[PDB]
Every structure is written in C-alpha cells, then in structure tokens.
Write a protein that binds this DNA or RNA. Structure first.
Ligand SMILES: [Cl-]
Ligand SMILES: [Cl-]
Ligand SMILES: [Cl-]
Ligand SMILES: [Cl-]
Ligand SMILES: [K+]
Ligand SMILES: [Mg+2]
Ligand SMILES: [Mg+2]
Ligand SMILES: [Mg+2]
Ligand SMILES: [Mg+2]
Ligand SMILES: [Mg+2]
Ligand SMILES: [Mg+2]
Ligand SMILES: [Mg+2]
Ligand SMILES: [Mg+2]
Ligand SMILES: [Mg+2]
Ligand SMILES: [Mg+2]
Ligand SMILES: [Mg+2]
Ligand SMILES: [Mg+2]
Ligand SMILES: [Mg+2]
Ligand SMILES: [Mg+2]
Ligand SMILES: [Mg+2]
Ligand SMILES: [Mg+2]
Ligand SMILES: [Mg+2]
Ligand code: NA
Ligand code: NA
Ligand code: NA
Ligand code: NA
Ligand code: NA
Ligand code: NA
Ligand code: NA
Ligand code: NA
Ligand SMILES: [Sr+2]
Ligand SMILES: [Sr+2]
Ligand SMILES: [Sr+2]
Ligand SMILES: [Sr+2]
Ligand SMILES: [Sr+2]
Ligand SMILES: [Sr+2]
Ligand SMILES: [Sr+2]
Ligand SMILES: [Sr+2]
Ligand SMILES: [Sr+2]
Ligand SMILES: [Sr+2]
Ligand SMILES: [Sr+2]
Ligand SMILES: [Sr+2]
Ligand SMILES: [Sr+2]
Ligand SMILES: [Sr+2]
Ligand SMILES: [Sr+2]
Ligand SMILES: [Sr+2]
Lengths: 56, 237, 92, 194
RNA sequence: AAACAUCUCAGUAUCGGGAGGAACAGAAAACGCAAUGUGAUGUCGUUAGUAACCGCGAGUGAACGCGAUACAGCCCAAACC
RNA sequence: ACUCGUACGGUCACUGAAUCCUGCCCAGUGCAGGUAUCUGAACACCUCGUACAAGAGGACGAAGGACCUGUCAACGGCGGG
RNA sequence: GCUUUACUGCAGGCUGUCGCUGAGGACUCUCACUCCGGGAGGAGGACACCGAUAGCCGGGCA
C-alpha cells in the first residue's frame, strides 16, 4: 500500500475547525487547542517574532 | 546515536506500562488495632491477573470484603485469622514474633505494617529460622538470610500456584498472552541484531558485540548494557 | 664532548682576561605569580581553554650547550651562544 | 539610649549564636512544613522591616517565601554547541535567590507591590526571605506621606522590572563611579554586558 | 579566524515576564585633568579605535575630562517624644 | 515507568525447537574481589615566605592505579619451527 | 550519519571534603533530618537525602 494516493482515501477525520476565539479554521477539535491563536492553550494571544523578518 | 530501548522504558509511555486498569487489588495485610479479634470467611477463589496465581476473596467479621494473598490449601468456607493471637494455621496472618521457628511463611513485611513485600510469587515461601526479642531471622526464596523486626507481619504457608514454572510455554503465542498482562515490551530484538546507531552492540558485517559485554557499574544509561557489573561469567571454574 | 671546568678567557665585566669556571645552568624554580599564571586562572573555565588546553611539545635529538661562565675574580657570570652537543662532561 | 530594635538587629548579626540560634532551630521545623509563600501578621525581624519602610498599618503585608538552594536548574543542550556552551553543572543564574523570592511573593499577591525584602536564614536545602508588600489601592496608604509614592502607575509590577532594592543591587547599580560603566542606566541600554 | 577548540558572529536571532507615553537612571561610602580642583542623572558631540583585552592571532574595546542639551532637589530608619 | 509487581520475580544481554554434545587458553582487553607496601586531589593541619595575602614545601591519604586473585555460554584466541 | 585506546570537552556513576549538623582513630546518645505506621508509636540518625567542591571512570552525548 503506497504512502501516496491510496493512503489519501483513508482521510475522513475532522481535526482543525473554526475557532471560537479567532475565527480561523485552526481549532483542533481533538486537542481543543487553536494552532493559530492559542485558544485553549493560553489566555494571551499566540504570537511570535519569527512571524516576520527580524528587522521588521 | 538514538536512545536505546532501556531508555525508552523510563518514560512510562503506554507501550511500557502494565495494564493496571485491569488489575484487581494489592493483597496487603489488614490493619488491626490490637487483640487479633479479626477473623473472616473465604468467600471465593479468584485469578490474579498481575501474578498468574490465585487470590482468595475474604469477608471479615467487621464487614470488610477484601482480596488476600492466598497460600496453597485455602478454600471456600475456610476461616482465616489476622492478629497477634491468631491461631498458628495455614492462611493466617500474625507478627513473626508469634510464629514458631521452622515455619514456612509468605507475604512477609519489610517494615512492620507495610502490608507485605517478600515472598509473594507463585509457590514460593520464606523460612522463619531464628527468633528473638530484637530480631527475627528469615531465609528468603533467593536463599538470603534476612534480618527483620519481629513485629513484621506474615502469612503461614507457601504461596498458591507452585510449579507454574515447570511447564514450558512451548509457543510464542503463549508467551505473548502472558506478556500482555505485564508491564513489559515483548518480543526481544537482540542488540547485536540492530544498527550501530541503536545499541552499543549494533553494526558490523557479521553480528557480534565488537566489545566486551561485562560493563562497569559506573556506566551511564545508554551504555550500561550486556552483563552489568558481572562478578564473573560463563559456567566454568 | 669534554669541557674544562676552568680556563682563561674574556670577562665582559672586568673587561680583561681572567680565569672562569663553567657551570651548567640549573633551572630556577617558578613562583606562580607571573602575569601568565594569573591569565591561565582567569581564562580557564568550562570547556576548552584555548592555549591553556595545549600540552608540552617535543624534543630535539640533541640540545645546545647551556652554560654559565663565572669570572674567578669578580664573581660575576656571563652567558654565551651554545652549540649542539650530545653530551657535555667537565674535566676536573 | 539604645532602641529596643537595636537588640533585634544585634541578635541577627550572628543567627548561629545565642537564643536566636535556638529559635531558628525551632522555627525552621515549622517553616519546612509550610508552603512556598506564607503571609505572616508580623515581621520576624522588626528592626529590619521598619528600616526598609515597613509600618504597622492597613495595606502593609508581610510574607515569608522559601526557595531551593544552589545553582541553576538547567537542562543540557539537545543540539550542537561548542565546548564553551555545553556547560550545565557550574552554571548559575544571573538573578540572586532573594530576587526570585520577591517575584514569587508578588505573583501570589497580584494586587500588591513589592516594597523590599530581607533574609531570615536557611538550612541545607533552601533559603527564606520575608517580603514587605503594599496595597496601592488602600486609602490608608494612598494618604501616607512615606508610602503613597508606591501608588503611581509606573510602580505597577515594579519587582518584575528590577526596580526593587535587591533588584538594583543585582543589576550592578550600587556604585556611582568606577565599575558601573555597563550597569547604569540599564543593563539593556548597555548591550547586556554588565 | 581563509582548518579549529579560547576568541568571533553576539548578549545578536529567538524565548519567558513586565511598565509607560515614553521607559530606565538619579542627589556620591562619586571623581582622582592629585587639586587652593569638579559636584545628582540621562543623552548628544568629543576624548578614541586612545587605556584595557586577545591561540598577544583574527578580532574586541571603555572611562575621567571637555563642549553641549536640560537642570532640582528631597523623603524615611534611629536618637528625643 | 517498572509496580494493584517482590527471586516460581523483572531487569540486562548472548544463543535460537527436539536429539548427541559443547575441548584447551585468564598473557592483552573488559568486569569483579582483595591488597602489607608504592602511588593517589581538595578542605583542615604544620614549616618557610608575606606586619596580611599571593606562593613554595611538608604531613595525612578516599575512590582509582601499581600489585594479587577470580572469570571465556566475557571481548576474543587455538600459530611458526 | 556512524566508529574508536583521534583531539577537546559535556552529562552520568563512584569517592574524599565543606554546609545542613546536635549531645556525651575507635564509641555512645537524641534533638535536627529520613523512613514505616491510620494513630500511638516504631526504625534509622547526625549518617543518609540535598547544596558546593575535589580526584577517578566516562563515544552515553557534543
Ligand atoms: Cl515470563
Ligand atoms: Cl649543557
Ligand atoms: Cl511588585
Ligand atoms: Cl574634575
Ligand atoms: K562557533
Ligand atoms: Mg498487594
Ligand atoms: Mg502489551
Ligand atoms: Mg531475540
Ligand atoms: Mg540490519
Ligand atoms: Mg552507539
Ligand atoms: Mg554471533
Ligand atoms: Mg515626617
Ligand atoms: Mg536609556
Ligand atoms: Mg573558520
Ligand atoms: Mg563573549
Ligand atoms: Mg591563525
Ligand atoms: Mg565585545
Ligand atoms: Mg574614570
Ligand atoms: Mg544467531
Ligand atoms: Mg537467526
Ligand atoms: Mg512516604
Ligand atoms: Mg561524535
Ligand atoms: Na578574565
Ligand atoms: Na503583585
Ligand atoms: Na560583566
Ligand atoms: Na574559512
Ligand atoms: Na571546516
Ligand atoms: Na582569545
Ligand atoms: Na586473558
Ligand atoms: Na550522512
Ligand atoms: Sr508490510
Ligand atoms: Sr491500491
Ligand atoms: Sr479514517
Ligand atoms: Sr490547556
Ligand atoms: Sr508572543
Ligand atoms: Sr504494596
Ligand atoms: Sr499501603
Ligand atoms: Sr556490532
Ligand atoms: Sr569451561
Ligand atoms: Sr574568568
Ligand atoms: Sr576548562
Ligand atoms: Sr623529536
Ligand atoms: Sr500587571
Ligand atoms: Sr545641575
Ligand atoms: Sr538445539
Ligand atoms: Sr583477565
């Protein structure tokens, strides 16, 4: 069984969903954590300096 | 390289955990104020998943239903006693001090009141040898002479299920089923059969530990494999 | 080779020829208080210590003469270039 | 004449001798059974507390905090490092324990502001400090000529920015001349070389 | 650094915590053009790639002072009540 | 974590059902034990040095090593004349 | 990436020492501290754990 096309047919699990806090489809319904804004993980909003060029 | 199997164990992930949610109970002796005024009736005999040996369900006078580490010879209906004044008979528990020298005992406590630590496995038994006002001497299953507080509680008789080890598993499948009831990763891939990156013995054209197996006690985890601090090896001499 | 313990030669101090005594230079003892000593303690820490992690070099097959020439009359010594010599024994 | 306070002061110059020694031996047994931050109604070292600004007044709080003794509790590198950056054992943190103590105390009382702190001993595995905290919202303090200054907005969370007496000392701000070239006005403005 | 380990890149990237409209510093247990002298603190120009550091290699690198900007000096603990 | 586990246990390894068997080697290397004597760091101690300190030396000496022993179903070895 | 008696280091283990730490080269005790006990109390005990440092080992890791 190839890792490619044939293995793609087994994918019918819902993980990432519309996030209550930020509105992005990043709320992982299994972990109950938003990979985009951090909801469910932290009160503070998920943010990182590497999201932009260092001097900008 | 990569951490060896022995190091993966320590993390306690599911693969290495025992099926505790399927275990019955921890056959620890009952706690009595004093007097020995405690007796119960063997209500049933059950299989203990964690030890592959039988356990006896007992109902005590004061209304407490608990499983007990049963010796060989205990059956339904029988009456058991637990306390200083307990009768000297198989299945009864009392402090070593009350036990007569030369009597086979099991589920011996290490420290008075801990519930029992020694000789709990199938068909084994400790042998109470010397008595005293300060120290009770017991010969444990390994043949070691152990010095215990005469206050350490114990059960008369040998543990039920003796001889379990006399029959060969015969097939992998049987080993399999037993291993599924323990905190153990099985089957076992030999270190010499792995890649160098995975074990000190891995690598090489033909399989062989390109090094002596007797490893020092001071060796760090990841390197402490093979024959740990062996005082000797082989069968010779 | 052989070397006379004493002989007449120029003393750069008296500024004239006088009898001298030859002696092999004995190593003086260190104190451990020179700047280099303090630098080693200051610059050595966790990990490699640069120059302070280096170990003693090798040896040349034969060493050069290393002697003191002491004037038999003013007591002062002077040094001279040395010359390679497998062994150096003094006569008398 | 000598103040009664001078006596508490003098006793604490040698916490290992006299009555004090016996007191500590007794007290520590109880402290060891207490939490990380215990509020206390009265300073163990009155003279010291009053000297640091303590007052028997509403809005003034004292809490004892214990912290594990020793160097940095650091994890060894899991990626490539040159020998110089592989150390783990002899590496120590840049903030002294008294400072870590002041911060834990201040976290416990989010609405209060650290005023100062002082040491109350240690055993072999931990150190204890008492921290004086003030309520910037209580009128008894808002009206105090000696403490109202701590009610200003720029004093909020002062401890976390090193504005404490222990904070300023640890930042190398004690000296006004030689040796403070890289500490004043801040470690950061000086490229973090102090 | 024409390899590389101290050094360098750099207290940089990135991470944790936190305040403000600005922060931080700040009224000498200072300076030490050594004086019959200066007089809280930032900052700017300079002092200067100087002193100092350094497989004394590659490289790293101040301060006092001076000219400026702006200027401001006070409150506790204790003694005695 | 193993572990509601306790030597009929469970950890670490080697070989790879049954059957008949499994020789010689402890010098090197590994492990382990012992060890009169030798060697063996720091602190404290002693002498010299410094009105102090740096420093030089001494005495004591843990593990470890030297040395001795055990061990090959321990790494491995079983040649030339 | 991998190896080792390559170079240099880093964890880790063993060991001495200092602090915790008390009373009367071998000893007793109890009061800190540790462990067992539901509790009373029992065991152990100035050791052990832990902090610091020193020597040895140290491709487990860089
Ligand atoms: Cl099994
Ligand atoms: Cl010569
Ligand atoms: Cl604060
Ligand atoms: Cl001036
Ligand atoms: K580098
Ligand atoms: Mg049990
Ligand atoms: Mg399983
Ligand atoms: Mg296998
Ligand atoms: Mg393979
Ligand atoms: Mg390997
Ligand atoms: Mg093989
Ligand atoms: Mg006033
Ligand atoms: Mg600034
Ligand atoms: Mg280069
Ligand atoms: Mg640097
Ligand atoms: Mg070069
Ligand atoms: Mg620099
Ligand atoms: Mg200056
Ligand atoms: Mg095979
Ligand atoms: Mg095979
Ligand atoms: Mg416990
Ligand atoms: Mg490597
Ligand atoms: Na230095
Ligand atoms: Na706070
Ligand atoms: Na610095
Ligand atoms: Na280059
Ligand atoms: Na290169
Ligand atoms: Na350098
Ligand atoms: Na051998
Ligand atoms: Na590769
Ligand atoms: Sr397959
Ligand atoms: Sr297919
Ligand atoms: Sr599916
Ligand atoms: Sr969460
Ligand atoms: Sr962020
Ligand atoms: Sr138990
Ligand atoms: Sr229990
Ligand atoms: Sr191999
Ligand atoms: Sr044999
Ligand atoms: Sr240094
Ligand atoms: Sr070093
Ligand atoms: Sr040579
Ligand atoms: Sr806040
Ligand atoms: Sr002014
Ligand atoms: Sr076979
Ligand atoms: Sr051997």
């Amino acid at each position: 069984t190839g890792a490619g096309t044939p293995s793609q047919g087994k994918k019918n699990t819902t993980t990432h969903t519309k996030c209550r806090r930020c509105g992005e489809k990043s709320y992982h319904t299994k972990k109950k954590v938003c990979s985009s804004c951090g909801f469910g993980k932290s009160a503070k909003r998920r943010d990182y300096e590497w999201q932009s060029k260092a001097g900008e | 390289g990569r951490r060896i199997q022995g190091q993966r164990r320590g993390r306690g992930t599911s693969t290495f955990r025992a099926p505790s949610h399927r275990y019955k109970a921890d056959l620890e002796h009952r706690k009595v104020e004093d007097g020995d005024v405690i007796a119960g009736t063997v209500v049933d005999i059950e299989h203990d998943p964690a030890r592959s040996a039988p356990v006896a369900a007992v109902e005590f006078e004061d209304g407490d239903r608990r499983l007990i580490l049963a010796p060989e010879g205990v059956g339904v209906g029988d009456e058991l006693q637990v306390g200083v004044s307990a009768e000297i008979a198989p299945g009864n528990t009392l402090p070593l001090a009350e036990i007569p020298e030369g009597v086979p005992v099991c589920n011996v406590e290490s420290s008075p009141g801990d519930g029992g630590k020694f000789a709990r496995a199938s068909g084994v038994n400790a042998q109470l040898l010397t008595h005293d006002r300060n120290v009770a001497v017991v010969k444990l299953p390994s043949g070691e002479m152990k010095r215990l507080d005469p206050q350490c509680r114990a059960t008369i008789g040998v543990v039920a299920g003796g001889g379990r080890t006399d029959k060969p598993f015969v097939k992998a499948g049987n080993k399999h089923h037993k291993m599924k009831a323990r905190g153990t990763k099985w089957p076992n891939v030999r270190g010499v059969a792995m890649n160098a990156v995975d074990h000190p013995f891995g690598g090489g054209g033909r399989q062989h530990p390109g090094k002596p197996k007797s490893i020092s006690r001071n060796a760090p985890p990841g390197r402490k494999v093979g024959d740990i601090a062996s005082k000797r090896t082989g069968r010779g001499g | 080779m052989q070397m006379p313990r004493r002989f007449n030669t120029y003393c750069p101090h008296c500024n004239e020829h006088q009898e001298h005594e030859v002696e092999k230079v004995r190593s003086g003892r260190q104190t451990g208080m020179k700047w280099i000593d303090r630098q080693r303690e200051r610059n050595s820490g966790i990990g490699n210590d640069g120059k302070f992690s280096k170990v003693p070099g090798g040896d040349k097959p034969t060493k050069k003469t290393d002697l003191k020439y002491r004037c038999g009359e003013c007591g002062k010594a002077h040094l001279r270039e040395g010359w390679r010599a497998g062994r150096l024994e003094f006569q008398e | 004449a000598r103040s009664a306070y001078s006596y508490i002061r003098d006793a604490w110059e040698n916490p290992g001798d006299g009555q004090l020694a016996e007191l500590q031996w007794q007290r520590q047994q109880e402290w060891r059974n207490e939490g990380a931050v215990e509020r206390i109604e009265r300073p163990t070292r009155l003279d010291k507390a009053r000297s640091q600004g303590y007052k028997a007044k509403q809005g003034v709080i004292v809490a004892r905090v214990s912290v594990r003794k020793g160097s940095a509790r650091k994890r060894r590198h899991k990626a490539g490092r040159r020998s110089k950056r592989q150390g783990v054992t002899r590496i120590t943190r840049r903030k002294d324990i008294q400072r870590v103590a002041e911060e834990r105390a201040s976290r416990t009382f989010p609405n209060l502001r650290v005023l100062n702190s002082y040491s109350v001993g240690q055993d072999g595995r931990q150190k204890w400090h008492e921290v004086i905290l003030i309520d910037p919202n209580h009128p008894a303090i808002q009206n105090d000529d000696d403490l109202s200054w701590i009610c200003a907005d720029d004093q909020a969370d002062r401890v976390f920015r090193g504005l404490t007496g222990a904070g300023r000392r640890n930042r190398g701000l004690s000296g006004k001349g030689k040796g403070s070239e890289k500490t004043r006005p801040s470690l950061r403005s000086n490229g973090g070389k102090a």
